[PDB]
Ligand binder design. Structure first.
Ligand SMILES: Nc1ncnc2c1ncn2[C@@H]1O[C@H](COP(=O)(O)OP(=O)(O)OP(=O)(O)O)[C@@H](O)[C@H]1O
Ligand SMILES: Nc1ncnc2c1ncn2[C@@H]1O[C@H](COP(=O)(O)OP(=O)(O)O)[C@@H](O)[C@H]1O
Lengths: 434, 49, 426
């Protein structure tokens, strides 16, 4: 089964049909003013009218600034691109800082391309090539469900010969793409020799021919990459692709102009449709002043995704300015370009509900006395520390032979693992021995 | 004693030196990873676009 | 005796993390002693790792220098063992010249989450009794175990393999039937006449062996990166690996996990001396610890309230509050006299040296006067002066000799204050 991650308990914004926030829903609690506002951002992103418009989630550590941003991704669902990045990823050693911003701005715009999947597979019963020489190759296929003959393009037959295919092999043909694979020799030929260097596979029990609608997701960044450098052009089967190492590169401005011009042509022909997604920048304050001054252009641009930023700093110095202080660690002239959402500190009565939601997600039964006690730890410390005690306390409860948390299991962990406050007190009282 | 003093090839001949030659194990790739696990293969229908 | 590459080192005496089923540490076992609080805590973390079900989790082992914070982190690795990834780095090891500092942590996080699969193979193994060939081609082979014999008609791709690899009657061989590769194990003892010699296999010739195999999640990224990937795995040419490839591979492994064709095995990252990371690198740990593929990580530090690198800000452990809020902090404690003497006995077992009981007493005094680690270094040098003396055992005057040959940091610093103008800079 799936692993329980830090945000695996949140399933959406959980707003009611009027747009108001419920007190507790979809794994979130409290936070009404902030999460009601994120509803308006989901309505904005789903409306597709806008480019480059941006939002800043601001407030103390442990208050929901990652939780709400991932809750937006759950409200959008897998059909809409959501690119997460950390502001600290901008410091590449192969490309300039502004390029790492531009690549991530291009990961957040998606094409949505529809095509029919068309698979033929089976034992090959015959091959017959038919300028007069090879117009096509007829190929015969067999499975336990029946037979077909197919008329192959000479480029597909060149691929059959690439795979060293012969009659009596079991083949997968992907007719919409020209992919070809040998699965193995058909086991009706498994006695052609007693010991030979081929692997034999049973005659496929599946249909000779299979259809699906499939929907392909591709970002503008995948186009910007795959068309910029000369391709490897070499499907392993080569050796020049061993010599020149692949590396990241400062992809030109002009090429993106042509990708935009080709994508415009295809969305007009209805072969593709567009989903402007979100770029989510964790730790935005970790961007350099040079990067912030690139966003003074990137957020204006008529193609750009919606951008969501997170920060938890006070009136600190702006990274790389030497001495300029500005709120949230973001330059005032960028801060004047974002809608700001404030994020509140939880009351203990909210924290107890988060602890319960985490416990029932994490798979832990907890007695009401111990859940009250983790609520008391929520008064002493922070939400993250109290949440982090659950699995540790469950393991001591399990070793002590019970399938539920009780007081002495959580009181043991509270003595055994310190928080930042208590350990900082222990450092200050021995400051001359570290 | 005279042999070495006369020419050291009478005692030991200078050997034909060559670098030390070595091979590791071949790096074993699983059949499952080889069938389902390269983006060059499992994504080829997308890569066409 | 001969010496292999691994020799007696600063943690060689630790052969586990000695615990009862109750996750309570007995006073001394599996090669380590004391630290009852920190080792009970490390037992709970070792069970969170072995359970695997909770993702993106952290423990910081903190306390005065020499207090076993690397010791419990190294013992925990021995107790965890093979069949779960464990990877260690020092904090200054991520500062690559050739790769982004942030990407170097992304590799360290994904060396340490394993994918595990099982595959079935038709393997033929036996003594080759006889082999025959003709001029297309045809030929015949015979194989033997201790319990059966066969003859076989060979196909052409086998004929070329057997003849290329000079397979001769009386070899004991393994044939990878799916692939035509031959491995030769040696020759049969009955044909050892006219090197390596071995007995025939037991059971039948053709076994449908099942192989379980594991690949680190990062090791799938490097296989995907280049026309041949695996060279860049060993040679270090892996650099700035394109993040859209990871966006695909993480999602591909996330369906293998649930179609049941693979299972993911959460391991450990041990990022030792964590206070070396920049605030830029902490900003990555702040967020990389919040996704399903994240391992548990152990971090170790010995710093007070200190300036965090890349800023003028001072905070506990040399880590921003930003990241300390993610994690649980386990405190080591300074050793008592009893525990100090008991560590010195165990180091004397691991180095294989005898010493007098009053020698252990004066060495324990030296240990308490010099924060243990210097006394551990005197053990070996005392035994070498004892060997120079042709002694059976280390005596008090061997230790008092060696204590005057090699200075601890405090006497070295005090002598450096006598000649204070003769050394350069102050
Ligand atoms: N409203 C909420 N309801 C339930 N859980 C929440 C809620 N808001 C936050 N969390 C909890 O907050 C914890 C940390 O995520 P959070 O969004 O608070 O990070 P953050 O501190 O705001 O992010 P950052 O470190 O980037 O500033 C998670 O364990 C999550 O379960
Ligand atoms: N509990 C212990 N049991 C046995 N040996 C220990 C123990 N704690 C420390 N040691 C020994 O003393 C050394 C000092 O502890 P260590 O973990 O290395 O401190 P630090 O990481 O702060 O430098 C260890 O490297 C090991 O040789």
């Amino acid at each position: 089964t799936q692993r329980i991650a830090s945000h695996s308990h949140v399933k959406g914004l959980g707003l009611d049909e009027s747009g108001l926030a419920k007190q507790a829903a979809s794994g979130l609690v409290g936070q009404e003013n902030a999460r009601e506002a994120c509803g308006v951002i989901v309505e904005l992103i789903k409306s597709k009218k806008m480019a480059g418009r941006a939002v800043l989630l601001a407030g103390p550590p442990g208050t929901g600034k990652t939780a709400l941003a991932l809750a937006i991704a759950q409200e959008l669902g897998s059909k809409v691109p959501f690119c997460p990045m950390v502001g600290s990823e901008v410091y590449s050693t192969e490309i300039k800082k502004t390029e790492v911003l531009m690549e991530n701005f291009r990961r957040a715009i998606g094409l949505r391309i529809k095509e029919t999947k068309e698979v033929y597979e089976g034992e090959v019963t015959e091959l017959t090539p038919c300028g007069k020489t090879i117009s096509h190759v007829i190929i015969g296929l067999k499975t336990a469900k029946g037979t077909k003959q197919l008329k192959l393009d000479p480029s597909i037959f060149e691929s059959l010969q690439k795979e060293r295919v012969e009659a009596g092999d079991v083949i997968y043909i992907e007719a919409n793409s020209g992919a070809v694979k040998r699965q193995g020799r058909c086991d009706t030929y498994a006695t052609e020799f007693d010991l030979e260097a081929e692997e034999y596979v049973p005659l496929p029990k599946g249909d000779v021919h299979k259809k699906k609608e499939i929907i392909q997701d591709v970002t503008l960044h995948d186009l910007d990459v795959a068309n910029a450098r000369p391709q490897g052009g070499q499907d392993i089967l080569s050796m020049m692709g061993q010599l020149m190492k692949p590396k990241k590169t400062e992809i030109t401005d002009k090429l993106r102009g042509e990708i935009n011009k080709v994508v415009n042509k295809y969305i007009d022909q209805g072969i593709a449709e567009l989903v402007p997604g979100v770029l989510f920048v964790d730790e935005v304050h970790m961007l350099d002043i040079e990067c912030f001054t690139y966003l003074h252009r990137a957020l204006e641009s008529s193609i750009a995704p919606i951008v969501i930023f997170a920060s938890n700093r006070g009136n600190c110095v702006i990274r790389g300015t030497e001495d300029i202080t500005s709120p949230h660690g973001i330059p005032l002239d960028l801060l004047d370009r974002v809608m700001i959402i404030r994020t509140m500190l939880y009351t203990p009565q909210e924290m107890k509900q988060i602890i319960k939601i985490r416990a029932q997600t994490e798979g832990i039964n907890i007695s009401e006395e111990a859940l009250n006690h983790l609520g008391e730890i929520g008064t002493k410390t922070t939400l993250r520390y109290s949440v982090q005690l659950l699995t540790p306390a469950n393991l001591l409860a399990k070793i002590n032979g019970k399938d539920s948390i009780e007081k002495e299991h959580v009181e043991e962990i509270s003595e055994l693992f310190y928080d930042a406050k208590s350990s900082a007190k222990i450092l200050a009282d021995q400051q001359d021995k570290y | 004693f005279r042999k070495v003093c006369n020419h050291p090839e009478l005692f030991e001949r200078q050997e034909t030196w060559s670098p030390f030659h070595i091979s590791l194990k071949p790096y074993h790739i699983s059949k499952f990873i080889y069938r389902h696990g390269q983006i060059r293969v499992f994504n080829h229908s997308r890569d066409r676009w | 005796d001969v010496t292999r590459i691994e020799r007696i080192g600063a943690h060689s005496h630790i052969r586990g993390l000695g615990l009862d089923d109750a996750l309570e540490p007995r006073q001394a076992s599996q090669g380590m002693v004391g630290q009852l609080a920190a080792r009970r805590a490390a037992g709970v973390v070792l069970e969170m790792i072995r359970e695997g079900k909770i993702a993106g989790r952290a423990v910081l082992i903190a306390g005065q220098p020499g207090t076993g914070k690397t010791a419990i982190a190294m013992g925990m690795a021995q107790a965890l063992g093979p069949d779960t990834p464990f990877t260690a780095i020092a904090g200054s090891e991520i500062f690559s010249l050739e790769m982004s500092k942030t990407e170097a942590l992304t590799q360290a996080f994904r060396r340490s989450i394993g994918v595990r699969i099982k595959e079935e193979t038709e393997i033929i193994e036996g003594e080759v009794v006889e082999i025959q060939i003709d001029r297309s081609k045809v030929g015949k082979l015979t194989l033997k175990t201790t319990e059966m014999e066969t003859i076989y008609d060979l196909g052409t791709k086998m004929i070329e393999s057997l003849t290329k690899d000079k397979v001769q009657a009386g070899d004991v061989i393994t044939i990878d039937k799916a692939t035509g590769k031959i491995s030769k194990l040696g020759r049969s003892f009955t044909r050892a006449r006219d090197t390596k010699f071995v007995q025939c296999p037991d059971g039948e010739l053709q076994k449908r062996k099942e192989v379980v195999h594991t690949v680190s999640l990062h090791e799938i990224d490097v296989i995907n990166s280049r026309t041949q990937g695996f060279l860049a795995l060993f040679s270090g040419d892996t650099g700035e690996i394109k993040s859209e490839v990871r966006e695909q591979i993480n999602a591909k492994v996330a369906e293998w996990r649930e179609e049941g064709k693979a299972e993911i095995i959460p391991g450990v990252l041990f990022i030792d001396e964590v206070h070396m990371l920049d605030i830029e690198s902490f900003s990555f740990l702040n967020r990389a610890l919040e996704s399903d593929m994240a391992p548990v990580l152990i971090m170790a530090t010995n710093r007070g309230i200190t300036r965090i690198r890349g800023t003028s800000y001072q905070s506990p452990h040399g880590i921003p509050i930003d990241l300390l809020d993610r994690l649980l902090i386990v405190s080591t404690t300074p050793y008592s006299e009893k525990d100090t003497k008991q560590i010195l006995r165990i180091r004397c077992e691991e180095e294989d040296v005898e010493m007098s009981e009053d020698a252990y007493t004066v060495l324990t005094r030296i240990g308490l006067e010099t924060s243990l680690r210097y006394a551990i270094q005197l053990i070996t040098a005392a035994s070498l002066v004892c060997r120079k003396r042709k002694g059976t055992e280390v005596q008090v005057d061997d230790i008092k000799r060696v204590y005057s040959l090699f200075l601890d940091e405090s006497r070295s610093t005090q002598y450096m204050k006598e000649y204070q103008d003769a050394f350069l800079f102050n």
